[PDB]
Point group: D2
Chain length 184, copies 4
Amino acid sequence: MSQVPGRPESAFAHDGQITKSPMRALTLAALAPRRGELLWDIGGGSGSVSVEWCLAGGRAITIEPRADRIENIQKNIDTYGLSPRMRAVQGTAPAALADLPLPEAVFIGGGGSQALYDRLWEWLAPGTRIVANAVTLESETLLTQLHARHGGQLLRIDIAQAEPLGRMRGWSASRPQLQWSGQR
Amino acid sequence: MSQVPGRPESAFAHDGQITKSPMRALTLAALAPRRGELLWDIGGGSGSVSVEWCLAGGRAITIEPRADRIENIQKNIDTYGLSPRMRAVQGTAPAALADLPLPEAVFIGGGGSQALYDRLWEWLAPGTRIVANAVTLESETLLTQLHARHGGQLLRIDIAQAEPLGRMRGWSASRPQLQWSGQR
Amino acid sequence: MSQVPGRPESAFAHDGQITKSPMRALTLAALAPRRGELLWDIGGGSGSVSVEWCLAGGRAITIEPRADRIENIQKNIDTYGLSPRMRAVQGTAPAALADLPLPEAVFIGGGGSQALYDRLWEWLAPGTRIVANAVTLESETLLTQLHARHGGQLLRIDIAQAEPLGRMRGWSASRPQLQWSGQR
Amino acid sequence: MSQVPGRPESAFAHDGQITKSPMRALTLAALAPRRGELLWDIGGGSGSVSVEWCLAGGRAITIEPRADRIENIQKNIDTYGLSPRMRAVQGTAPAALADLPLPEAVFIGGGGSQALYDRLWEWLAPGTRIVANAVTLESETLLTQLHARHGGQLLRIDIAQAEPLGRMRGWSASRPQLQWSGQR
Ligand SMILES: Nc1ncnc2c1ncn2[C@@H]1O[C@H](CSCC[C@H](N)C(=O)O)[C@@H](O)[C@H]1O
Ligand SMILES: Nc1ncnc2c1ncn2[C@@H]1O[C@H](CSCC[C@H](N)C(=O)O)[C@@H](O)[C@H]1O
Ligand SMILES: Nc1ncnc2c1ncn2[C@@H]1O[C@H](CSCC[C@H](N)C(=O)O)[C@@H](O)[C@H]1O
Ligand SMILES: Nc1ncnc2c1ncn2[C@@H]1O[C@H](CSCC[C@H](N)C(=O)O)[C@@H](O)[C@H]1O
């Protein structure tokens, strides 16, 4: 079992919603976990980002509304013997982050609206690290405005795979993603 | 300091030829270090891949012809106290590889030719993992051929960054890079 | 000489600010000249869009503030004997637009601000076609907003070219460009 | 009806196989038709590239094996009153090009193997223009080798559209295409 992020999708329980391995390698690079650091993983999903954060030696709380997804998250905590360093929390951000200890880092997988970012600026200790991925055009202008307001690094990421087609190979149909890496 | 690959380019002595931090994350994700595994790093440059591979628990031999770049590799060995774990060899592949112990993984950022690959193909223990980045049409073609012959994974990767443009921002002008990841 | 848009950049007097030939093809495709239709070309530069629009049978008014660039527009008018069909106006939109007859189509390669668009929105006959290229994060955001408000088509476009790289070839480093095409 | 290439897909009879409008704008830009010039459109499909070549004032022969596709091609000749400037030919290249008059330009939509390119170099008058689009990795290395051997322009083209997803917008999943524009 690998000592670095980007571990296969199949290292995790998940439905058809999971940060794909190369994106997750990028995401963890930007999160930059130090040992014992806390992360709020807003979005959650399969919790795979949290899992790699914890395997790098971090502690993580992983917020997620959907019940089916929370089961997957929980299986992944057990599978990696991650209690109590990682906690699944069933809820919806920002509301679900009201009664939680302040973190050193925040990952906005999913749920990234202005209301979230207003609350975050209201609730978080200055210099708390933020990392966000956006796949919609609306999420993208949001990350672009955040980068205008507060600086940081803003990356545009395109990754495709080679695949069958049908006696030949093609590039898999790809979407770019924006990622913002900043503070506060 | 960060517990995962893709640390900033300033965490390393380098001369301008370093592997960019997000690409370094992707590569290490493909290399997938397990504790104590050995890496051949062909085309060391400033040795950043090897440093992050060894920081994840591996050992590495780093092959670079240029004495001035070797010196930077040496500093990174020093900085991170990796001398038990990490060796520099001044030289050219394939000649410099000939008396080395066989690795568990190989990385080619260096001058990857068909010669190098035929030699690697003859020498390597079956199941040894290979990872290569290409940034020329000629080396990309080569990876695609390698992929057609041997399988594994072939990724096309484009990463840009938000850069100044007068009082405006613009995407930095990037090249896609091809990355093959296979074995044997 | 070629009967379609996207003629080489050498078929025009220009100063370095010209629209690239493949982008000029895409733009004219979006503009879709019918015989005798009128174009407002905001941000003329060297007037290449207008030249190709008028060569397809249209008429155009070309708006550029810089006297030295106007001179290049003038040469292209001369070269192609377009003076009955094509006018240069030295100035800035929106002021320079105020006494012009209303067009059948408008192209903004020029300084496209929200001001310009509010004014264009008030002045223009409903069904007038609009086409804009963006190369900054700020102008791209604007196009996306325009798209959300008004519909039409929004394309993301990346074009690179095979360039030397020592004795090897590599892709030239390009930016994506956003292009909106709508009406009213 | 527009005086330039890139006309909508729906301006043509076609099954689910047709050069998409922006690609076709690019393709015709590179073909550069002059009035009365002959084109072999190898591939054929719906014949849309031929149709725009002829509407620019060119003559075209359009080779295509599949019977269903040839009906579409023929409907497009009738619809645009293109007889006899455009001829549908049911066959398979290179064989199907044995008894045909020599052209000024060649478009390799589909069917682009080495056998084709060996025959073409054997059958065509020096300085005959070639334009080719490739979507597979094998077709791409072929166009890359052709560019090594004979120069010309080699472009990498990525175009995406904005589209629903589901209360938001996404970029449509896109494949890059290589296009070679050369001679002989
Ligand atoms: N307001 C909100 N707060 C928290 N999570 C939300 C949310 N809105 C949507 N989500 C969740 O965000 C997830 C999408 S992202 C899933 C991928 C995940 N990052 C992974 O690595 O596995 C969905 O599971 C969705 O239920
Ligand atoms: N035949 C060969 N054998 C070993 N190294 C080579 C080589 N040809 C070129 N190289 C080296 O490969 C380097 C380019 S790649 C440098 C990036 C490196 N992976 C890093 O992270 O720092 C150059 O320094 C060059 O000297
Ligand atoms: N407010 C404004 N009104 C009109 N033109 C403007 C403007 N601001 C900038 N421009 C012009 O827009 C040009 C950049 S775009 C040049 C490309 C042009 N379409 C061509 O094919 O040649 C510059 O020359 C600049 O002077
Ligand atoms: N050897 C060959 N010779 C000629 N046509 C071929 C071929 N192999 C495949 N084709 C055809 O090439 C077509 C794919 S391309 C279709 C898009 C077309 N360029 C258009 O603009 O409408 C298919 O119709 C296929 O039947």
